[PDB]
């Protein structure tokens, strides 16, 4: 139920330069025309970006970054919010995110993907370590799972007890493990406010 709903908000992204696709990823709509995307990819410039087959230039949207204070050096989240000036509004799924949740090691984890490489697909694995999103792994959550380059931006769902919620978006992974960038509910509503 939650997976299908999220999948409906997930769109394929293709980033282009010199008329060549230099990278692909997923965009997870969270509300209005705002999408969570991989910051490492969107921190760069592109001649063009395709969202669900729609051609756009950077003048068709704005990207926001989240920074969280931590011991000595503050963390810049790999989860960014791309807000389009125009477009069909997605389902508001901000309520499916959390502010305090705890995931035990070995508990089920599900990734929601929709990209040009594999189309619409779900990857499942398990929490690699115990995790507390906290109202030493600031903003990050690791898991065992078979992931590919391009799954970044896709939503990761976990279990806060018998409760399933959206932890954040896949950032990277390889050889059986990966991690996502945690996005708290207050973070989204706060940025939404901005």
Curated annotation (Swiss-Prot):
It comes from the Viruses. It is found in: Host cytoplasm. Residues 1-188 form the Peptidase C3 domain. The active site is at 40 (for protease 3c activity), 78 (for protease 3c activity), 152 (for protease 3c activity). The record marks 171 as: Important for catalytic activity. It catalyses: Selective cleavage of Gln-|-Gly bond in the poliovirus polyprotein. In other picornavirus reactions Glu may be substituted for Gln, and Ser or Thr for Gly. Cysteine protease that generates mature viral proteins from the precursor polyprotein. In addition to its proteolytic activity, binds to viral RNA and thus influences viral genome replication. RNA and substrate bind cooperatively to the protease. This is Protease 3C. It comes from Foot-and-mouth disease virus (strain A10/Holland/1961 serotype A) (FMDV). The chain holds residues 1656 to 1854 of 2332 of the full protein.
């Amino acid at each position: 139920d939650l997976q299908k709903m999220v999948m409906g908000n997930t769109k394929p992204v293709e980033l282009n330069l010199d008329g060549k696709t230099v990278a692909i990823c997923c965009a997870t709509g969270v509300f209005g025309t705002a999408y969570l995307v991989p910051r490492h990819l969107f921190a760069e410039k592109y001649d063009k970006i395709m969202l669900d087959g729609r051609a756009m230039t950077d003048s068709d949207y704005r990207v926001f970054e989240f920074e969280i204070k931590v011991k000595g050096q503050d963390m810049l989240s790999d989860a960014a919010l791309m807000v389009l000036h125009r477009g069909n509004k997605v389902r508001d799924i901000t309520k499916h995110f959390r502010d305090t949740a705890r995931m035990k090691k070995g508990t089920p984890v599900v990734g929601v993907v929709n990209n040009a490489d594999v189309g619409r697909l779900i990857f499942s694995g398990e929490a690699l370590t115990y995790k507390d999103i906290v109202v030493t792994m600031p903003g990050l959550f690791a898991y065992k799972a078979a992931t590919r380059a391009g799954y970044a931006g896709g939503a990761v769902l976990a279990k806060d007890g018998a409760d399933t919620f959206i932890v954040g978006t896949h950032s990277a992974g390889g050889n059986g493990v990966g991690y996502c960038s945690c996005v708290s509910r207050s973070m989204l509503q706060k940025m939404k406010a901005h």
